[PDB]
Paper text:
The main established association between HLA class II molecules and RA has been correlated to the polymorphic region of the β-chain comprising amino acid residues 70–74 (12) that line the MHC-II pocket close to peptide anchor residue p4 and that is shared between HLA-DRB1*04:01, *04:04, and *01 alleles. In the present study, we focused on citrullinated α-enolase, one of the candidate antigens toward which a large number of RA patients develop autoantibodies. In order to assess the structural bases that underlie stronger T cell responses toward HLA-DRB1*04:01 in complex with the PTM peptide Cit26 compared to the native α-enolase epitope 26 in RA patients, we determined the crystal structures of HLA-DRB1*04:01 in complex peptides 26 and Cit26 at 2.6 and 2.0 Å resolution, respectively. Both peptides take prototypic conformations, extending throughout the length of the binding cleft of HLA-DRB1*04:01, using residues p31F, p34A, p36P, and p39A to anchor in pockets P1, P4, P6, and P9, respectively.
Author numbering:
A (entry chain B): 1 to 193
B (entry chain E): 27 to 40
C (entry chain A): 2 to 182
Write the structure that this text describes.
Amino acid sequence: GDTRPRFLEQVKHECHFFNGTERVRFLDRYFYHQEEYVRFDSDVGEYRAVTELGRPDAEYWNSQKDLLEQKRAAVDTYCRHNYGVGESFTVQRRVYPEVTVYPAKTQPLQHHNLLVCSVNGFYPGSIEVRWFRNGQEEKTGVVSTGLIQNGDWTFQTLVMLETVPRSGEVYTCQVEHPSLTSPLTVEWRASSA
Amino acid sequence: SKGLFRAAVPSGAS
Amino acid sequence: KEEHVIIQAEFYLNPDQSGEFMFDFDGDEIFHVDMAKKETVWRLEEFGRFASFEAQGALANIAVDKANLEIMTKRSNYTPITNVPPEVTVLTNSPVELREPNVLICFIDKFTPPVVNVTWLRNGKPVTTGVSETVFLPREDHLFRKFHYLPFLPSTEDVYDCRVEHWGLDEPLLKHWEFDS
């Protein structure tokens, strides 16, 4: 609808945490459209122009002593401080996965099918999902969507297995996740239903 | 028990 | 590699005169500031019990960003942003069973500028009832992502779509979903 040209300023103040808070890196990043033009990186300790467009800003701001000391304190005053405030419901947050198993194509036996394992609602992102046929793990024929972020502090993943079920067979999906102290296991037995 | 988030401030350009 | 990242992300966009202030923990939103209401808005209501944020401070930042934008626009010889059209994916919150409450999720990815018109369609007719959306979320490549949500009761009779408009697309983009039987 609107074909008027557009103009965008972004600013990202980023705190990167390694080994709890025992190493923190603070980045103050300025963007024009998508182009980073100037940044302060606590590891460098002054502003550096990323693109020629940022030189006037790097040079002006680096001439301001109070400004630099202030950016140099940001690892503590800003990053550690905010890590403190949010830690309890972010870093510590754990929601259990829900596991559901089903065939994708309602087919007869001795015919190719995808058994779907749907893992849903979990936090944080890290998870592992294993398929077994009888008691034997199968890493062959595993087709996965990967980690999908739902945008609401939960993730899902869908892990499918390529089978040809014959009816004397049992298949199992095993899930591990930090919220759990033991795997959640879900079975599917090969028959008409 | 109730903490306050601090905003980092952008500098005015030349 | 790093355990966690907290990003305070701001923008201002002309000539729309529109801006965002938000916090982000590992790619999920803690909160944002509704520039209209001048209020902090927690992504989950529970976060607000544990923390607080002086929203007036966000609006000041935005004013600095607006004023800077004017400067940057000149400095670039009035070079505008290149549209990057979005990718859209629709998926369910949990697996689909008939008559069992569920939520359709519209994941809108890898676009800029942060202006989109989104509409859930049920059988080609819009639906506002019970729906929700995030603000525009930052990406490491400096594009944006966004989610929309529609509660629904699955059915053999219904079809659904996520209709996304954006200046980088020639036409509206529909992503389709229907009960799978």
